[PDB]
Every structure is written in structure tokens, then in C-alpha cells.
From Swiss-Prot:
Family the entry assigns: Belongs to the Toll-like receptor family.
Residues of the full protein shown: 536 to 698 of 905
Species the sequence originates in: Mus musculus (Mouse)
Top-level taxonomy: Eukaryota, Metazoa, Chordata, Craniata, Vertebrata
Tissue-by-tissue expression: Highly expressed in lung. After intraperitoneal injection of lipopolysaccharide, highly expressed in brain, heart, kidney, liver, lung and spleen.
Glycosylation sites: N125, N130
Superkingdom of origin: Eukaryota
Name under which the protein is recorded: Toll-like receptor 3
Disulfide bonds: C112-C140, C114-C159
Length: 160
RNA sequence: AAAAAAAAAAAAAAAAAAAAAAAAAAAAAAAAAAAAAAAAUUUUUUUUUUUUUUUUUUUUUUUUUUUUUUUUUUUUUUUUU
């Protein structure tokens, strides 16, 4: 199922969000790139156990609700590049990262802070996921000291 | 049998005045009613024309990366009749 460039942003409060993908078990790859989505409500990826790929790139996503991906235990490739993601939390990207094969979140305003990337930096340090241009297009945007700084070269010894 | 004067009563009819009332018609003044035309405070709805913000489709233009064919400007080491 491919929904590239369809302006689905406001569909996810116009009388309640639409619970799209209701019991769509056999879907393999889902692509919703460049739809301008701003907020993804909880309980929208339920019952998607056999899904393998999610592509939500070229959007503006900064409000990552907890437990968005709960049934995505079989995800193989997650694409979120060229978005407005600021922080990567464990409770949001945990289950999708259990067996992820390729990850793409380049060109994002990452925040090089303890609360934001510590878990992500630890995961990157202790994973074998194939990520392209990890050290080039993953520079942080804030603060000034960490502006334009590689994401992989972050010390988590002062965190947790 | 008839005709007249003082003095006291009673009966029919006509024209009057005052009082107690009762009806019909006509004038106002109050208490209400049903309406066909009116104005004036508040909250909402439809439609037309236009303002602002956000997200995307088509087309056009600028810059950068990469790839394929022609005009080719050159060449170093060689071969060559």
C-alpha cells in the first residue's frame, strides 16, 4: 500500500481521528512519504503484525506519542528521513528496533541532549543495523555547542 | 213637569306639571380579547462575494550531484606501409 503525496496530515481534532488500517494483518510494506503528517495519535498501527516497512519521510513529525508502534515487532525497514524529529525515545521506537534491518532518519533537526538521544546513541553504538550516511546527514541543530555535530560521536557517560 | 244661587261628595274623556322607577337607541371613560400591517434587544442557521493561517497536486525557473551519446581540442609509449 503506497500513499505518497496525498495530503493525509489533518486526517490524523476533526470529530475524532480516523482509525485507518483497522485489522489489516497481511499488509507487508506501508508507504506514506511526503504527506505532511504533524501528529500521529495512539492506537493507529494496531493489529499490524506482518507489516515490514514504514516510510513516513518528507513530513513534519515532532510529537511522537508513546507506544505508537506496539504491534510492529516484525518491522524490517523504518524510514523517517527529512522530518522534524527532535528526540528519539525508547518507549516510542523500541519494538520497531527489535529486529530492524535498515534505518533512515537523516536530515532531521536532532537535539544533542541527554533526554533526547542518549538511548538512541546507545542503540546506535550497540546495534548492527545498516544505516547509510549515518555520520554525515545526522548533525544536530541545537544547542549552539552541539550544532553541526555528528550524532554517532556522542558520549553517554554523563547520562543515565 | 221645568228653570236657576250659596254648600258637600262621586264618575267617563282631553290637555298638563312633579316624583319613584324600568326598557330601546346614541355618546364618552376604564378593564379586557382576536387578529391583518409595524418597529427594537439577544442568541443561532442557510446562501453570495472576498480576507488571514496551515498541508499537499500540476506547471515553470535557479543552483548542485551523477549517467549516456555526438562536435571534438590535445596528447605520452608504441605499431605501421
Amino acid at each position: 500500500l503506497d500513499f505518497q503525496h496525498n495530503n493525509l496530515a489533518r486526517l490524523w481534532n476533526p470529530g475524532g481521528p480516523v482509525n485507518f488500517l483497522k485489522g489489516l494483518s497481511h499488509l507487508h510494506i506501508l508507504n506514506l512519504e511526503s504527506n505532511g503528517l504533524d501528529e500521529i495519535p495512539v492506537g493507529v498501527f494496531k493489529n499490524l503484525f506482518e507489516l515490514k516497512s514504514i516510510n513516513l519521510g518528507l513530513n513534519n513529525l515532532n510529537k511522537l506519542e508513546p507506544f505508537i508502534f506496539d504491534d510492529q515487532t516484525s518491522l524490517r525497514s523504518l524510514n523517517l528521513q527529512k522530518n522534524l524529529i527532535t528526540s528519539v525515545e525508547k518507549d516510542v521506537f523500541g519494538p520497531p528496533f527489535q529486529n530492524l534491518n535498515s534505518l533512515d532518519m537523516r536530515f532531521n533537526p536532532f537535539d544533542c541532549t541527554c533526554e533526547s538521544i542518549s538511548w538512541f546513541v546507545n542503540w546506535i553504538n550497540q546495534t548492527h543495523t545498516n544505516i547509510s550516511e549515518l555520520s554525515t546527514h545526522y548533525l544536530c541543530n541545537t544547542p549552539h555547542h552541539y550544532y553541526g555535530f555528528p550524532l554517532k560521536l556522542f558520549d553517554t557517560s554523563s547520562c543515565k
